[PDB]
Design a protein around this ligand. Structure first.
Ligand SMILES: Nc1ncnc2c1ncn2[C@@H]1O[C@H](COP(=O)(O)OP(=O)(O)O)[C@@H](O)[C@H]1O
Ligand SMILES: Nc1ncnc2c1ncn2[C@@H]1O[C@H](COP(=O)(O)OP(=O)(O)O)[C@@H](O)[C@H]1O
Ligand SMILES: [Mg+2]
Ligand SMILES: [Mg+2]
Lengths: 437, 441
């Protein structure tokens, strides 16, 4: 909207003209005539945008501004004569360029777009800190290093990827890392979660509808990557259509005849045994062979236990950022129990456990260690729970469980249990029977 | 970038040149010479970008009318207009109507290349923020939402009070989003996380031999998460920001002017701190021009079922776990709990339930036994040989203690509504009242 802009030019009429139009728009404008006055203005306060004259030199100052302030957009002011240098400045780090003489509306528009893009990148950084959704693969283990090198090798190719690994191991993160290291890194990254899509709406989610517009995952993925997250959750009807899209890169939109042609790089994943599903007749053999082109195996947390301390530390920093809870020191006993667990939910389960620990100790002293007793049990019927029952039934269940527990406490000695609970021997017998013990 | 670009211009010379330059850059370019050919091309496949002439002669709809039709069908599809020299008023009109930018005839190939790249980059960044990104029907939530709506368009300093995980930061972002600084930065300072020795450096930066949060927040909002953790020297410096709209960097005399709207929060008793001499009296009153209280989750138990459903849908989107049916037992337990970690704690427990039931029968209800000890052990449940207090008591005393604990827990669950509690526990309401009075609970 209305930001702090620094106008760097050697001519006063340009400094006054640019600063004038922008200030009149609602911005705060400061000026500088050379590199030293520019660097000093940035030292007074970091601006949200810079307008830099190519011939002051401009390109050297452009490198310096971008070195110290990578997130600060710089728009070049260029002479009518040469666009070659203005284009050279874009490659060196400049956002855009403006040509003399310019219309005021052009100057206003360029400033707004440079600020909008800068705001979008800042909103991206801010939202990644809240989602705890960064694109970095933490792990010093050999399983992690081999995975990182597999990513580095398969990403620059155009090959179809098949990702195998258990739930929460990092299959989606690997797919995003493959995308960020591919030729389609600037192209879209579209995800299809079969598990979280109703069967009655799968066709519409993948192919869209004929004519505000409902655009399917395949059309949205055109020129980029389509991530089929957990293919094993696709019904027979869905498996058929996917196979059919793989043969010709074409499909119809639901309700329509129009055959849309797409150009998509497919990355698939499974935490399931697909070859076994083929034997059970639940998964198509032709689909499997077409999706299983280049394999990428993401290791289980059980295959990289030595990474758990580094991951706990990494997750504690994310939650410190999200919640404002200071990171804690995990006790050697609690860490030993964590490192020994089988982790069916892998890293997603580890993060969830780290977050619960941080919530529970939020009030505690900083020097206090997180102890093994704080760890949950894994590390009756719904109709029978006391909280879900009315008073009489809830009272009856409590009475039954109390007596059962008191009997076990006295190791089956009914007469001593009776005496302690405040009952006569035969009355306890009749009560136990009436309660169905 | 290898994008699908639709080029719409009535001039064949123009279409060929735009399609030619962009196709030579590595893009896939398509052309149309009127509205109907353009809409037929969009129907073939939605492009990633549209170049659109403002005029469009010999067409069913002109350039601005087609711009409107493209944006209606595809709101996130960037449209760059093609305009003639001296047509800037009509081009600026297209920007206000939904166009991303415009290119003025005649243009350099490198200019067209740069406009395409910038439009696509902005489109992609919007796609990221949409992918990554206040629930409750309670009067409490409705009052909070109408408080945000009222004070967000003002320029007044806010003091947000409430327990940890209740939604203070989310309230601050909601105020930011509805304020005149919504396009400005939203900078947070986690005071509980920063060491007292590094607090000044984080807020005010250092002289060069570095950029503080206040300098980053210029033009926007600075969110001071937990003001109680600020040292006395930091307190005096914030006071100068509030009164003088300026400060000095760490180890300097150099003035730094700032235009910030401060939002402060605390889960602590600041009044208790002023009484003890650890927090400045004048600073507290200046920080609390407009007080906003976020209610504890235990004070809005009505919203727990809605929050459970909202959090399930959110984890479904993140993890790819199908949302499940929470058993009446698990819901009764979740609703009755005190929640010292509030909405964060609730969310973390819903995620826990979805992680642990991943791969189980979709019909199978999520039961209360899956919840951890801090949830289950604070509420009525079947006793065991390990429950020292119950075991030390005889039958009548143990049954009376259970009655008291069960009724209180059910009351909590129903937010103190005795008529609703009576209905569930199997009593008439006056009978429940007489039973509570008799029990003295
Ligand atoms: N190597 C890693 N380093 C850091 N965080 C990771 C790593 N692998 C996964 N995560 C995180 O763990 C969680 C689960 O990972 P995810 O990619 O969704 O796995 P999957 O697709 O196998 O279920 C996510 O929050 C993700 O960011
Ligand atoms: N009413 C609400 N509806 C949905 N989610 C909420 C609501 N209030 C808070 N949250 C969520 O609860 C969690 C804790 O909120 P947060 O703002 O971080 O609390 P605080 O700042 O008080 O510690 C976050 O995940 C947040 O998005
Ligand atoms: Mg000049
Ligand atoms: Mg024309």
């Amino acid at each position: 909207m209305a930001a702090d802009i620094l106008v760097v030019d050697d001519e006063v009429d340009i400094r006054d003209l640019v600063a004038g139009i922008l200030s009149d728009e609602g911005h705060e404008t400061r000026t500088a005539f050379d590199a030293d006055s520019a660097l000093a203005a940035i030292n007074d306060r970091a601006p949200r945008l810079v307008f830099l004259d190519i011939w002051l030199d401009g390109l050297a100052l452009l490198d310096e501004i971008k070195k110290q302030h990578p997130e600060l957009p710089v728009v070049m002011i260029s002479g009518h004569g040469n666009i070659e240098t203005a284009v050279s400045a874009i490659r060196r780090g400049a956002y855009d360029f403006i040509e003399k003489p310019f219309k005021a509306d052009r100057l206003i528009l360029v400033a707004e777009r440079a600020l909008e893009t800068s705001k979008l990148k800042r909103e991206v950084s801010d939202l990644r800190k809240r989602t705890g959704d960064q694109l970095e693969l933490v792990g010093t283990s050999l399983a992690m290093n081999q995975l990182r090198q597999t990513i580095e090798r398969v990403a620059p190719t155009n090959s179809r990827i098949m990702i195998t690994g258990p739930s929460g191991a990092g299959k989606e993160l690997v797919a995003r890392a493959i995308h960020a290291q591919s030729s389609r890194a600037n192209g879209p990254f579209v995800t299809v979660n079969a598990a979280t899509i109703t069967p009655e709406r799968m066709e519409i989610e993948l192919f869209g509808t004929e004519m505000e517009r409902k655009v399917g995952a395949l059309e949205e993925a055109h020129g980029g990557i389509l991530y089929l997250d957990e293919v094993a959750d696709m019904p027979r009807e869905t498996q058929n259509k996917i196979l059919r899209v793989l043969v010709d890169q074409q499909f119809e939109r639901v309700g329509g005849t129009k055959r849309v042609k797409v150009d998509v790089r497919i990355i698939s994943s499974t935490a399931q045994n697909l070859e076994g599903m083929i034997a059970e007749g639940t998964f198509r053999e032709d689909l499997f062979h077409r999706l299983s082109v280049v394999p990428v195996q993401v290791p289980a947390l059980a295959a990289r236990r030595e990474d758990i301390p580094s991951l706990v530390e990494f997750f504690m920093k994310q939650i410190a950022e999200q919640a404002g809870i200071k990171p804690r020191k995990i006790g050697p006993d609690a860490m030993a129990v964590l490192q020994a667990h089988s982790w069916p939910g892998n890293l997603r389960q580890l993060r969830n456990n780290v977050e619960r620990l941080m919530i529970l100790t939020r009030g505690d002293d900083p020097d206090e260690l997180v102890t093994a007793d704080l760890l949950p049990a894994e590390i009756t019927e719904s109709d029978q729970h006391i909280m879900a029952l009315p008073l009489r039934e809830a009272r009856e269940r409590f009475e039954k469980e109390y007596l059962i527990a008191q009997i076990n406490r006295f190791g089956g000695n009914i007469s001593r249990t009776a005496e302690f609970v405040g009952m006569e021997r035969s009355a306890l017998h009749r009560k136990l029977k009436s309660l169905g013990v």
